[PDB]
Symmetry: C3
């Protein structure tokens, strides 16, 4: 037996009315495929003579090891997109523009404009607050070696006439000078001062000074000759005073030097010395002493003499002449 | 021939003892599947009449193109999670709170509390160090246009009596005033000064001033009449001095003005002028000059006259009278 | 019929020249597989008797639900790598080192070195610019409670002799003192001052002061006895002046006190009081008054008396004697 089977093309079977007997094989001549009867279904309704079920395969691939789009996308959604996030490099670029508390160099203007909780009082207030209690360096060090400039090293301004605090307050304890101003020897000379003060306030002294020295002056002024030439400074003075009218004023009645003792002093009110030797002085009662010959271009009013070294008055001279003129009138 | 095959249900075959001959076909009536004998194995041990090997399929899907869970997870592990990382927006929000070195506006208090490497010495020390050597602007500009306040523009305090530096040190070179204080004309008047200084230190002058002017005063004071009225300022003075006891003190012996020359000067020690015309003066030897009639409510002790314009003493008058009284006693 | 088929091993078929008739089955004895003739192809060129097409399987797995390496990698490429990006923690660590505009504490040196757009002029210039116009706290608060130190609280230096701005400029409006210096009572005494000024400039006053008080001194100085002991301060003075030569100088001609009125004043040029009672004074014309007995160790040159209380001259005495001597020569 060489066995052959009912056979025709798939599509021919597809519209055949032939019922294969149970187990009877039929062959699709154009596919090579066989199908077996069940005794009732038409060919197109039989299944193939062998399994077509994925689970029955061998050498399956590892499907359960493969990543699902859903599961992958859930995991991606937890990850940060490149575009919503700075790189380390861009991060560093940004931070390098910010000032470290450890310190740094400002190349632009640092403004303060406090919103003000209270900005406190004492040594815990201030927009800028510097405590050097544990350290040996300076607080605010401002300098310039520039040739010229348009603004000062430091400037303090108050704008409103009611302003009821100071521009600068110095509260000092220590063993050297609270405030020290050194204007040192010019090469190119200025016509100006170490400290210059002007006040247009008529109800207050331009400068007020109180001290309580045991053996010194409240203000001590020393003039030093700028030259080795004995008389170069002949127009100089330790203290110079001028008394002027207002521009377009009619004049002035201001005094030059006014000295008082409100509690009363027993010291000399004015004491003038040269080489530490008294030369002139006004005692606490207003009597003066002068060491040398003196001149008045005018008269001197004074009391009649009682001691030999007293200046005589015209009254005293005249009376002594008149006395002698009488007495001598012994011509009866 | 319509050929039919040994046939029964899968599960019936499954416990049949029938051995299909080599190549003899048997049919599972409930699956449609055939199996062929090998001449020894029971049906359930034969394989199907056609391949069930994944590798022999056609139209395979691209399995090797698919991503494995393992490989995907390795790649995810290199990616940054959203939660461990700032967005650009959150990054910007944070940096916008930090101060640019280029500059910015502080709305709160900037404290310094240096840890101190040394904090240096000279023009490279300081918690705040400002070098204006290459620029034309001001260093520290502090101002207020507020009506009133609880603190000063600038405050300098030292707490310990040993403190051996200054609160403020000014070392100036230039062509204008090192330090300039302008208190300009009040609308609402203060009873205070441009500069006010108090010292309770008995071993040091409250203020010390040294200058070396060729032709000026070390201190120059000018009083200007605040009014056009010639005599409005009649109680004013360029210099006013008071000398007081301590509260509950017994008094004082302090002098008003003390002038000395420790090296000896040939200048006038006190020179008083009006309209640049000498009116009174004390020469370097203590002789004085007064331009006009003067008064002493008391006597004057002085030496016997030798020139015609010298004040006569009571001794000199008395001796001349006594001489004339003798001589005239020519009555034998 | 038990039907058996042409059969041999796969590899034997593989080189058989046998042509199966159309539909005639042949069996691979070592695989169990059948193939059916087409009437022309050799065995190795027939296909299996049943389908081997993936698309015809049942129980396919969801291949289209699986993620492709390509698609996964495209999605990964949008995600940021861990290594190119700061964590929140590292971000915070970096920002915590930067200064908040809200405020903070510097532990190191804040230098300024302005690049300078113009650094402006007035109350909008400055490397540090503090506006307290809306607030009640201090501007710059510098203090130290340290025992000793190597630098001052504040330092202002200018290096070039042309420098044409001030170190410190105070422009004040208000109702208290523009600048106030308090050196308060020492426990450990300093031999120094609240304010100390030195100038080596020979073309300018060390200090210049101008005021326009109605009824006060431009400078007011008060010395207060530091002790309750009436005469403890007997060597003290409100104002002390010294006049010295240059080191290795030949001497000096500088004056002590120089008083002038450039516009002419009607006030007393020098007025000395004790307990508010005039004791000595120099009037605007140079006439003086002294309240008590006075002494000159020398002569006094003055004009001939005209009133009874005028000091007599030697000329006047001599002429009156000579007159009486003549007249009395009535002895013919």
């Amino acid at each position: 037996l060489r066995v052959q089977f009912k056979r025709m093309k798939a599509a021919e079977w597809a519209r055949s009315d032939v019922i294969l007997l149970e187990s009877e094989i039929g062959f699709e001549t154009d596919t090579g495929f066989a199908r077996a009867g069940d005794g009732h279904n038409r060919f197109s309704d039989l299944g193939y003579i062998s399994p077509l079920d994925y689970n029955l395969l061998t050498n399956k691939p590892n499907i359960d090891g493969l990543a699902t789009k859903v599961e992958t996308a859930q995991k991606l959604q937890q990850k940060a997109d490149k575009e919503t996030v700075y790189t380390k490099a861009e991060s560093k670029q940004e931070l390098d523009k910010k000032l470290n508390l450890k310190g740094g160099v400002m190349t632009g203007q640092l403004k303060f404009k406090p919103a003000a909780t209270v900005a406190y009082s004492s040594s815990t207030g201030g927009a800028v607050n510097i405590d050097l209690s544990s350290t040996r360096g300076a607080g605010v060090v401002v300098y310039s070696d520039n040739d010229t400039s348009d603004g000062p090293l430091m400037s303090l301004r108050t704008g409103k006439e009611t302003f009821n605090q100071s521009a600068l307050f110095v509260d000092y304890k220590g063993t050297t000078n609270a405030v020290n101003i050194a204007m040192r020897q010019p090469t190119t000379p200025n016509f100006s001062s170490a400290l210059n003060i002007t006040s247009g306030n008529e109800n207050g002294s331009a400068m007020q000074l109180r001290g309580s020295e045991k053996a010194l002056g409240t203000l001590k002024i020393t003039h030093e000759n700028p030259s080795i030439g004995a008389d170069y400074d002949k127009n100089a003075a330790a203290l110079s005073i001028d008394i002027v009218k207002k521009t377009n004023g009619a004049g002035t009645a201001a005094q030059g030097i006014y000295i008082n003792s409100t509690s009363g002093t027993t010291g000399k009110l004015l004491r003038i010395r040269n080489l530490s030797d008294d030369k002139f002085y006004v005692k606490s009662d207003g009597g003066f002493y002068a060491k040398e010959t003196s001149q008045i271009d005018g008269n001197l009013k004074l009391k009649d003499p009682t001691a030999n070294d007293h200046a005589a008055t015209k009254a005293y001279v005249d009376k002594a002449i008149s006395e002698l003129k009488k007495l001598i009138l012994k011509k009866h």
